[PDB]
Design a binder for this molecule. Structure first.
Ligand SMILES: O=C(O)c1cccc(-c2cccc(O)c2)c1
Ligand SMILES: [Cl-]
Length: 242
């Protein structure tokens, strides 16, 4: 069911880093990773939490649809793309934390906790501030747990409406061409050690789907581009994409 190939560690060590990639072949029901231990180590989800947060906001009516405009609050932040109006699509694309902090406040502690339990999401623990627990609170999730959650979303099996799941999968759209479609979300966790970057999602092919979840050490922001580049290089090496 699960295969470990330690030779794949080279994808990370060649960049003076360390990390884990987890792949799941949906047709064959088989998983692959460079490091079984780290595949099951739980980290802060950081901005990968925008996937469940979006689902909950939509299903409760906090967010009406993917066109609703969330107005900039006029506070200048250090990320230029955050200092503008957003909808669900662009808020996901630019990982706009302050928009999702407001989602969480309107959702509230009680409904957030119940929905994460219903999703079987990570350790299901929202301890901390309701508007920041995915950045510096008690919630934790592993790469293998991310895949389990993403598989439910793909199949519309999460305990929210089909509509809510379709909208979030639209907002996850990252890349598409004649050969494949990638739906995914990045994450960048800095407030609790160890600092890591995430990329989780899946690759749609004509006749199969490959789920993936990766995290890697991220001592500075200079390496953030490695999250997608390394993942895509693994996918190419395993002949999942050209
Ligand atoms: O990697 C990203 O998609 C992303 C999107 C928005 C903000 C950031 C970010 C947040 C904090 C420090 C930093 O250098 C970059 C990263
Ligand atoms: Cl789409």
């Amino acid at each position: 069911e699960w295969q470990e190939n330690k030779s794949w560690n080279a994808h990370f060590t060649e960049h003076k880093s360390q990390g884990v990639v987890v792949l799941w072949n949906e047709n064959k029901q088989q998983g692959f990773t460079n490091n079984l231990k780290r595949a099951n180590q739980a980290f802060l989800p950081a901005s990968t939490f925008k996937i469940p947060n979006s689902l909950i906001a939509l299903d409760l009516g906090v967010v009406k649809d993917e066109h609703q405009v969330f107005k900039w609050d006029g506070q200048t932040r250090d990320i230029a793309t955050w200092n503008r109006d957003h909808n669900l699509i662009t808020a996901m694309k630019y990982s706009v934390v302050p928009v999702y902090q407001e989602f969480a406040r309107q959702i509230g502690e009680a409904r957030m906790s119940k929905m994460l339990h219903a999703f079987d999401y990570g350790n299901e623990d929202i301890s901390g501030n309701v508007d920041s627990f995915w950045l510096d609170g008690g919630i934790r999730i592993s790469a293998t747990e991310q895949i389990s959650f993403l598989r439910k979303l793909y199949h519309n099996k999460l305990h929210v409406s089909e509509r809510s799941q379709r909208i979030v999968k639209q907002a996850m759209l990252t890349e598409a061409n004649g050969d494949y479609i990638i739906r995914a979300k990045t994450g960048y966790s800095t407030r609790i050690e160890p600092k890591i970057g995430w990329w989780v999602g899946w690759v749609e092919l004509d006749d199969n789907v490959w789920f993936f979840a990766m995290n890697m050490d991220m001592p500075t922001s200079d390496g953030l581009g490695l999250r997608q580049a390394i993942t895509k290089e693994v996918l190419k090496q395993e002949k999942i994409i050209p």
